[model samples]
Target: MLDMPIDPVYYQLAEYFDSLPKFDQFSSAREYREAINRIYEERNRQLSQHERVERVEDRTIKGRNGDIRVRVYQQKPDSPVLVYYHGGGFVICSIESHDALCRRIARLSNSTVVSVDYRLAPEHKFPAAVYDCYDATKWVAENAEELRIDPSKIFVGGDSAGGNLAAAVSIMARDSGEDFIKHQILIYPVVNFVAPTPSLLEFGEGLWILDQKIMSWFSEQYFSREEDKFNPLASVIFADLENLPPALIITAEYDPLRDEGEVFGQMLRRAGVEASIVRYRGVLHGFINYYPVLKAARDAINQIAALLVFD
Candidate 1:
């Protein structure tokens, strides 16, 4: 049980979280991933009829590791594109886990969404996920006409570990001189893996849905060496921020990653890049998947929709 009282909305959502099977740190990554998928599949809300897209297609792209799976949600042929990565701390979760969220994003933002199923870690270690995401983003831009989206208005975004990849992809694009990425939407991104923030101390317990132990487990699987944690790709807060795409960062007050996410936004602004941060107070991490229970979830989608510019 939580030592302190949680928010009213969070208290209401507790029952759903409580029903989930608790996994220990000793559990295999595969076991943990399976448990999370089962809980989310059962508990996460599905989108309403109007929120569904006109078409959903699954395709494969050449990745550094091998072929990567991607799901394309086509709302309109002429809409802008958002290349999305699903969050699972770089080890778990897949396109199937985040299917509903991608559909909602497509409908709400009026944009075509290419949700990438990048290779996970432990099986694939540090920088594999990063390379997979960059490859997908590049493919999306190069095949914009085939994807039925505007090449000039492509964006990259995702939640949690996905958000980290989005930021990393954006950085890679900048360094490689690929200018197709116009904006980035990082939803509660893991910005700094090395240091613990105040919010981590407050919310990194099992009570908040994202336990600290699980996070450390994720880090260990993702990085084969200790120094990999400081690499800008893994820790974007330490990266050079000049000339990256404009960003809209969404964070929850109760999330362990909140402080780091906000810091990344601030760093971007300091570097003269356009960056905005919106913190939803009284919400937990992964609230984006709890739209039915949290009004803030839907509101955040609306906010993203408003922030996006279509071609």
Candidate 2:
């Protein structure tokens, strides 16, 4: 599906992912999370020194719990603001880990990007991460005046679990009449936590990001009790999709999260939300951060910027 030339740089990374075990079917749930974290921690370290955009400033928004760490990437005064959550299965990442991405979003889209470092799961669990994200969105909107943001032009977005939170937050804000987020950008998000789509069966073993170890780890970590998987906040595609903000859904052709992301996009459109479904062929998950050297990554970011800026 990837039509672009396969450069050695891209292939080397892809090969490394290909070499990893497919979900470690032998390990227990706890061992799975720790094992995947060990592998990806090194992966994260490898990406630590890549080129990045310069942000205007950074701050941590105090949430109801304690503090929701945020990195502010500003372009112009009173411009639109995008509150982004980074993907780590709602467990193993923070804004500091995704610093390069937050800065790129602000630089590419020319909107102030506030990357939320919400609480993670297994320790914090289920609604903790969700609540922190909700609070962060509210704080950003409420303090728009002080932050020099256009309250009406706020956007909520994220990749993977962060995407899951962004969708849930939009529904929560819209239903409660709390705040108006102008757009939703989901990058290969895991919208359904309980049910597995066919993509999970087809590419679950092949694709790198949401491997068996990682997927099971996320599912088990985010939901303390097995019954919690039925909760709409856990599997947001089950939530009422009506009255949501304009959405930009980006999915990967070879990723396990692809089908679920597309289904969620269609749900938003059927509910009359202006949703744009974008698919990137020949790529797996997490390509957005790999954009420093990948051409398709650049293309995806530009497409997102175009939707936010002109849509």
Candidate 3:
């Protein structure tokens, strides 16, 4: 599919996933959600050791729809905070599915990581998850003293759909005149909804974790209105990228979302916002979620920790 083959390890994984039923095989969104969540949870449960943190607690914050659950992986007192969201195309996955990565990020960055369990789609629909994420972030900022986090160093980040939510939250904050978020960490985010990119045209198919088929399914389930496809809050690349927080975008070389991820960084820079992007070669989508399983995953965490600056 490229000049160089996928990493040997992921090539093997690709075969394994090839053996499984495709998303179309699942008769309903509920069926697909259960199967996918079980797969990640099973894989993560085997690792077991990334659970090391000074403390991990479950907390609740008010969302647009009432109470929203957040998992706090705290490393130390008086540290920066990373308000995170998980990826599932805005339809699946939860805080539990991302527990390991959240723990690793917390320990490596010495920051309190708050993973939000926003409501999913094909159920809650558009603007729901976005609002929930924004409320969670705003709650974290408002309760910084109670959470024992440095008010000056709050960050928002996530993978894919979560990354979109993080960007939307940053935009929401900027639009509202809030200065709570200092930086953004986007892992192969879904930034553009209208413009076509090379990565999507190339990797949009095949047996990788994400593809155009799956992306279409997600959009079908998440968008209740047709025009939402261009909402800058959802398709962030459509929005003006000015005066937003600095961003660290990580993408896998052989994934469908790769180019747009880099493109978003380029746009942010053009808007005069500090944005840096790193593409991990020979990898595909959701590689960071592999954590210690993939050397590149660990390296990405280390690099993110090094790149983080409170200023």
Candidate 4:
């Protein structure tokens, strides 16, 4: 065993997933997505803090291939804007799924928040989500005046696969000769889509919300070609970490993705980028979803908000 205690509060969600048909047992990605997304939607609907933030709106922006939908939580006009991506293993999740998280960040950070709805996989496939996220960030930065946010204060962030997209977007933007992105926030992100880290072996069983089976399923659905597994866009660990903005990586001690997140943090530092790694022990992946009840989740949010240090 990996000697996991996995904070009791997290078990409420673990037990809920245990009640459903195992994710890997699903025959198709659609079937798995529908079942889980519905559950999260319902849970979020019940737990949402409706009155936070001055206003929230959904808008569409042009993406690399088509129109991309985004949810904007405006805390203050002309404030810093954090462009966020919702993580669902590149297959599930939406702006609605992460509304609560964005709102909390907006309220706590006193900054505007734009949550991207990137195209999911098994439908959009590799580089699709990457392109959508990059395009969204570009739009947010270029249209900062109309969006009423500081163009020079753009930050890219997300949890899990979304974090992967955030990091990839940062790399793409850096290569584009853009001077917009100021920071990158990755929460228990998926960095190494190719190599299996030690944590994957230690906690890959049905230990928590994620497991080897579901990760395998997600990988198969997201990567259609062999080279896709090593592509910098899909596997950000393969990207050039140099010249990228500073990074703040949060990892859960018992998460299957923990090792890779830490490894990427090290790679960032090695590339001469400032990267901070904060590991929350006794928790599993997706602990941030339980912010209403989890102190560490709230702390992570505060830590993220504090990172801006904007004038």
Worst 10 residues of 3 by lDDT: 302-311
Runs in model 2 deviating more than 4 A are 1-10, 18-56
Model 4, range 1-311, lDDT digits (tens) per residue?
Answer: 34656677765555665686556667888888888788777777776655388978899998868999988998888889899999999998888788888888888777889999889889988989999999999999989999999888889999999899899999999888887999999999998877888899988885757888889888888988867899887788988878999999999999889999999999989999999999998888888887888888888888877765445
Clashes of each: 0, 3, 0, 0
Could you give me the TM-score of model 4 versus the true structure? 0.95
Screening candidate 3 with a backbone cut-off below 3 angstroms (N, C-alpha, C), the clashing residue pairs are none
Each model's lDDT comes to: 0.85, 0.77, 0.85, 0.86
User: Regarding lDDT, does 1 or 3 come out ahead?
Assistant: 3
Task: Compose the digit string of candidate 1's lDDT tens values, residues 208-281.
Answer: 57878878988999999989999999899988899999999999877789999999999999999999899987
Tens digits of per-residue lDDT, candidate 2, 60-176, equal 778888977776778667778888888888767566566666666667676788878788777788888888989989989889998888898888999888899998888889778
TM-score of each: 0.94, 0.86, 0.95, 0.95
lDDT against true structure, model 2: 0.77
Q: Name the TM-score of candidate 2.
A: 0.86
